[PDB]
Specification:
The structure is a homotetramer.
Chain A: E1 8-9, H1 11-16, E2 20-24, E3 27-36, H2 37-41, E4 46-53, E5 64-65, E6 70-76, E7 79-83, E8 86-90, E9 95-98, E10 105-108, E11 115-122, E12 126-131, E13 136-141, E14 144-149, E15 154-157
Antiparallel strand pairs in A: 2-3, 3-4, 4-11, 5-12, 6-9, 6-11, 7-8, 7-10, 12-13, 13-14
The complex binds chloride ion (CL) (3 copies).
One chloride ion binds at residues 10-12 of chain A.
């Protein structure tokens, strides 16, 4: 029926979407154009985003999720995946997945063309995200965001 | 050990993939590469699928609890969604909020249809198959398939 | 402050509550006065009920939950607890708990005074409940209640 | 299975060994705890028969964000403090706490032992406030993080 045409986004509908200019709240160098495919069609439990990262910019602030899984599939362009210590070049057709607690990561575009990726994530009401380079932990609980310096956390049990 | 979370394009080309046939539709045959299982994802499925000409992606279905989406990488297909057909092609995306639309995809083209299928993985779901008139209740490993004519709907 | 006083239900408030006359839809003998202490204060994820079962009546239709836990604490009087193929007498201060899939049960009051219990249970958006004596399975899924004769269920897989 | 294991007679309960419990933030919150739920295998609710002696408390004044809790008084008398008001409690009284409704604690200022059933949700994640200590506890699957409220940057609320 005509009332489910909206669930299909053709390639050219996607191309013409403006998307949002997004800067990560802890990294002014993490700047991207974000086209939320999931929000366009009404998905509420996962995020599916077509992102464009220009040369010299990053995908995020180096981070590790405790409850939300996340993944990235490269569509065009080339980048550098930083994962724990290590750096890995990435290219189109590459996939990276992050099970909970597995590995902190960020992606940079140190190339000469736009890096275009699908970013795929769970959307949960509660999560904990660490930002090791900032020494901060975010507790996110049903819309309440609580950012705490890791030095201020008394760990009673691990 | 962190290298295991990255699958290069070349590694993905070398993956054998699994031959999969949908339990309710013998024409729903694909070769599936579970990218999420290869890196250890447990709450989402992310699969790279190949559907040959004349075959389908699934049995026409509707989820009550798991969200699902499809992103076309190469080739061409026909999406059947709430009894309407739409041609699909590389770069097209279709997503399914729960209870929104029953669908299936067929490859009536000449070249392989390659897609990424992205879904939630939940311990409990209910899935309708309108052309079979069956509802599947899937509950932690127990699968119960019931003809819709045998379901008595109750009020709260 | 004053807006919190409603979270306390004193003994006299409780004894004065009329409660609801509740009859299980699968068992006309399962008739009880139900005082929902949890709904009175605003609990949403648990059910806490003070129930009265008169002599000759029962607590429920014999059933098994697959996802919601349930428990009973006897405050006064006596009853007969049926679990699977076994019957046990119960009396004041006794406690019975039902982990998921553990045992089908019902309680009868075959004594001479009212049987008064606290019934404590989870409230989940999804559950499956079996009524073995009626040959029925109930699938409850956020507001969609689906009752199916057990012979009409094709079991394709089990864990 | 052996169904007799799901039934605890009043006598069995009488006989059960109590666990001596002291709240981690309040040395005056001492009780003897009998976990009825654990004794029979319940995993998603806590049902405890507790004994609080004269001069002791049930807890450190607190508020749950995700787990519901309730108390039903079996014998003895106590004083319920809830949102800074005091109420006498006695046998047959019930008090319940929807999430975020009210901070409370119970004190036994009587002369007899205070005996109650404490009924609670058991969740993997919870947030708990202790207003008298100006601390927040983030409990996430076995990791316990205690943070002074002064050290929390609230970036967003609901
Ligand atoms: Cl297009
Ligand atoms: Cl830490
Ligand atoms: Cl019938």
């Amino acid at each position: 029926g005509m009332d489910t045409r909206k669930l299909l986004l053709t390639a050219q509908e996607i191309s013409r979407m403006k998307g949002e200019h997004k800067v990560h709240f802890l990294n002014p160098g993490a700047v991207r154009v974000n086209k939320s495919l999931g929000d366009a069609v009404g998905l509420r439990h996962m995020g599916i985003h077509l992102i464009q990262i220009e040369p010299g910019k990053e995908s995020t602030e180096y981070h590790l999720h405790h409850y939300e899984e996340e993944a990235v599939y490269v569509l065009s362009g080339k980048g550098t995946l930083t994962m724990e210590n290590d750096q890995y070049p990435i290219a189109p057709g590459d996939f990276v997945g992050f099970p909970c607690h597995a590995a902190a990561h960020s992606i940079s575009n140190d190339g000469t063309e736009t890096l275009v990726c699908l970013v795929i994530g769970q959307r949960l009401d509660q999560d904990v995200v660490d930002y090791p380079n900032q020494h901060k932990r975010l507790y996110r609980n049903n819309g309440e965001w609580n950012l705490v310096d890791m030095a201020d956390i008394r760990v009673l049990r691990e």
